[PDB]
Design a protein around this ligand. Sequence first.
Ligand code: MN
Length: 190
Amino acid sequence: SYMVARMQKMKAGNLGGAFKHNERVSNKDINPSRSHLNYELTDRDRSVSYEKQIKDYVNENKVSNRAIRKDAVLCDEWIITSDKDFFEKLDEEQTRTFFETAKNYFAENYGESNIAYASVHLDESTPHMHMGVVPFENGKLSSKAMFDREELKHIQEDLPRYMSDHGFELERGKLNSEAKHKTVAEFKRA
DNA sequence: ACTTTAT
DNA sequence: ATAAAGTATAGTGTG
Ligand SMILES: [Mn+2]
């Protein structure tokens, strides 16, 4: 099976929808009886929005005096998953351990306190995690600095290896893959 | 590399 | 006027 890891940039304007989705605050593929099986791997407070948690953290820690820009990438939400075959082979403890391990990889490489949320979804087709990583380093908030072309190349190589080194039977995606990302809605059509 | 943003 | 960070990136699956 392939390691699936892929980030989407979240601005203020889409962290609302990310929070509502992830916290399940009635789509064909959500099974509502399974929603209570979901879990959050960070110690974050569930009544506090992603926008508020991240902006407070960045404002309280940033070196510059200038306001966070309105078009700022406040976090990179990584989807961490694999195929169905992969998870069918794992019990509950193992499944949890898989996401905790992936969370660890981003914590150890990008900063423990940058993992704003790690929301594991079992109530959809395949187990996966939405993991918000704040691109905050050296007192600066910059997805441009943290996730650039070489860094995404490095993660596609080194993350699947790290996961494999930690117990999990997963291979990296195809090096130089020509695939174009489809949205969930676009992938469903196909 | 070029453009937007907040000084 | 300035300069940091905005723009995609790399990967596969029914996020
Ligand atoms: Mn989900």
